[PDB]
């Protein structure tokens, strides 16, 4: 799994 913020 991923998890990304921007």
Do not use: Q, Y
């Not at 799994?1 to 921007?6: F, I, V």
Request: no cysteine; net charge neutral; hydrophobic share 15%.
């Amino acid at each position: 799994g991923s998890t990304s913020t921007a």
